[PDB]
């Protein structure tokens, strides 16, 4: 119970500063977010996304609402976290550690599995309906946590252990314990370890099912709203034509257009075979419209050019009655496609921005002598340190409800339609 | 089996005349349309002409609208071109070829099915 | 018109070479392209029927491939009796139908 670097460790007498205000002030953040996030989640529940979604914010919810209450107490009697209640000595810093590290590795898992699994739907169609079901998948969430309580009840076997932050409240992992041992070493670099190869997993998962949707949306507009708009356009200029040669050309543009819009294919049901009833649909309106190009076309080679121009709008009839939703269902399909992959990134960022400093701390902290004073330059930044990796709990819910809620969700549709 | 057989050439002089006959055998011309392509001696191959027998659709090549005229009929299953005002520049191997009808297979596979020539000649 | 423009024109080859002859459509025509083998004195036969399909009957040695408007027939080997002239055309409907010029190929000494 004497150490230079880290001499709050026996420090029963907690400093009178602002840290309970703020303390106060973010958990009572906390807590309203994680209240109105549910709120609004719940009615439309009653994707695998989505439910992934609430079950992490469950489980945040969860974690704040048990963690606050003790830290509370524990300011109640102005004194610190070391002692508490006579029979209880030590144990609460210790439950304050094990919890906090329990919740943060349960947190980066489940983002995790969110984006592998939103990659591989979009990537991996035949997998995606051949294995995983969502009963199969709602059960994810306790496997994380027991993974999580598995990994962190190793201090309690002791490879590792935890020490107290001041001012009488924090515990957290030993980090440099004065260049000694290779136990505590090496449980904080397999720790945050682990860390940095989920974060970089995460955002390579990320990048493959960014590049995967750019890639579904080229292959949809070259293969069906290029031959689409010729098709407008070339009408456009029969209906505005004078001359037979004119309507034959632009029939014959038409023809070609058509043919190949025939061999496109929607960006539902591309696992689905040729012979699936919607694509028989599909394939027999475009009979249709290629048999009346014909009838135009056998009537313009004659020199009479009205007639064309009826079954021109005849064309116009059938391509309105048969083609449309299927287009559509196209275009509504990839705005959805694209929501749900800006809400993984933009949690993704969050994650990765918020936790890479205490893994820096560890790297740096490890295979280094002691330098430096360990007043104001351990303690400051260990403390930004903890904050940085605390606020993750705070802030995770909010933009959520910033991006879901139905007024800012119109005015994002409007941001996104404007260029 | 499938088979399609010309009749009718032979040396005419310019300005003069001819009628070639082109008979099928083993399935009707009812189902199918049909078309007319010639060769020249030394050079490449070039369309000339067009008969639908359901719709009565024809159609005819720059080189040869308004001097030929193609017909058909199916009480004797066979089609018909005319020759009228003929000049040294038609001289050339003629055949005959069938094309399928919209929708399906029959329309995507075009000219699976050929005649066997005829040579026509025009000198003076 | 739709002019369709072949090359080479005279390939000089061997037994067991790769023989590639190029077609290029000035309009899109879609994939309705076919290719035609003629022997001195006799009438065409199809081979390819779609850009891309093997009519019944022909060897499987010969391959038609389209990127874009740019069109492709390959021999991936060569045996004596593939010294011919081939043949080009598209068919977009029935009265607008055009050849290409032919590409006869010899044999190397």
């Known amino acids: 119970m004497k150490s230079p670097f880290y001499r709050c460790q026996n420090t029963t007498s907690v400093e009178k500063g602002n840290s309970a205000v703020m303390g106060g002030v973010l958990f009572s953040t906390g807590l309203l977010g994680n209240l109105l996030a549910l709120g609004l989640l719940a009615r439309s529940g009653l994707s695998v996304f989505y439910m992934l979604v609430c079950g992490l914010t469950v489980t945040d919810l969860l974690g704040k609402c048990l963690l606050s209450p003790v830290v509370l107490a524990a300011y109640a009697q102005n004194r610190s976290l070391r002692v508490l209640a006579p029979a209880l000595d030590n144990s609460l810093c210790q439950a304050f550690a094990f919890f906090m590290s329990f919740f943060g590795l349960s947190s980066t898992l489940q983002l995790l599995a969110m984006a592998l699994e939103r990659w591989l739907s979009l990537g991996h169609p035949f997998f995606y309906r051949r294995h995983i079901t969502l009963r199969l998948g709602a059960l994810v969430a306790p496997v994380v946590s027991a993974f999580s309580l598995a990994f962190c009840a190793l201090p309690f076997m002791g490879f590792g252990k935890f020490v107290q932050y001041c001012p009488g409240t924090w515990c957290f992992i030993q980090m440099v314990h004065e260049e000694g041992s290779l136990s505590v070493l090496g449980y904080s670099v397999l720790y945050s370890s682990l860390m940095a190869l989920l974060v970089l997993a995460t955002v390579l998962c990320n990048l493959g099912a960014m590049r995967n949707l750019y890639a579904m949306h080229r292959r949809l507009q070259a293969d069906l709203e290029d031959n689409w708009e010729t098709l407008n356009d070339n009408l456009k200029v029969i209906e505005k034509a004078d001359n037979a040669a004119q309507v034959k050309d632009a029939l014959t543009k038409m023809r070609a257009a058509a043919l190949d819009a025939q061999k496109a294919t929607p960006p539902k049901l591309e696992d689905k075979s040729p012979d699936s009833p919607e694509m028989k649909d599909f394939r027999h309106g475009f009979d249709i419209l290629v048999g009346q190009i014909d009838d135009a076309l056998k009537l313009a080679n004659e020199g009479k050019v009205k007639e064309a121009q009826a079954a021109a709008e005849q064309l116009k009839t059938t391509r309105n009655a048969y083609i449309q939703k299927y287009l559509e269902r196209a275009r509504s399909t990839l705005l959805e496609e694209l929501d749900a992959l800006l809400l993984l990134a933009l949690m993704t960022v969050l994650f990765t921005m918020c936790s890479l400093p205490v893994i820096y701390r560890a790297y740096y902290g490890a295979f280094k002598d002691v330098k430096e004073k360990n007043r104001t330059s351990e303690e400051a930044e260990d403390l930004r340190a903890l904050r940085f990796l605390s606020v993750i709990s705070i802030v995770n819910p909010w933009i959520f409800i910033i991006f879901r809620s139905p007024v800012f969700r119109i005015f994002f549709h409007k941001i996104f339609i404007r260029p | 089996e499938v088979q399609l057989v010309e009749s009718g050439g032979g040396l005419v002089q310019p300005g003069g005349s001819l009628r070639l006959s082109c008979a099928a055998s083993?399935?009707?011309?009812?189902?199918?349309?049909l078309h007319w392509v010639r060769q020249a001696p030394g050079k490449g191959l070039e369309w000339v002409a067009y008969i639908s027998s359901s719709s009565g659709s024809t159609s005819y090549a720059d080189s040869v609208k308004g001097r030929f005229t193609i017909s058909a009929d199916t009480s004797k299953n066979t089609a018909y071109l005319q020759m009228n005002s003929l000049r040294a520049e038609d001289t050339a191997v003629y055949y005959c070829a069938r094309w399928g009808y919209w929708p399906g297979e029959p329309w995507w596979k075009a000219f699976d099915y050929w005649g066997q020539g005829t040579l026509v000649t025009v000198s003076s | 018109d739709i002019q369709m423009t072949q090359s080479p024109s005279s390939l000089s080859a061997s037994v067991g070479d790769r023989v590639t002859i190029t077609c290029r459509a000035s309009?899109?025509?879609?994939?309705?392209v076919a290719w035609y083998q003629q022997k001195p004195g006799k009438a065409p036969k199809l081979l390819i029927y779609s850009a891309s399909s093997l009519y019944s009957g022909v060897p499987s040695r010969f391959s038609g491939s389209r990127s874009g408007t740019d069109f492709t027939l390959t021999i991936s080997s060569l045996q004596p009796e593939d010294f011919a002239t081939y043949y080009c055309?598209?068919?977009?409907?029935?009265?607008?139908?055009?050849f290409g010029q032919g590409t006869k190929v010899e044999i190397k000494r």
């Open positions: 055309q598209q068919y977009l409907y029935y009265s607008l139908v055009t």
């Open positions: 083993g399935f009707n011309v009812v189902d199918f349309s």
């Open positions: 309009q899109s025509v879609s994939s309705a």
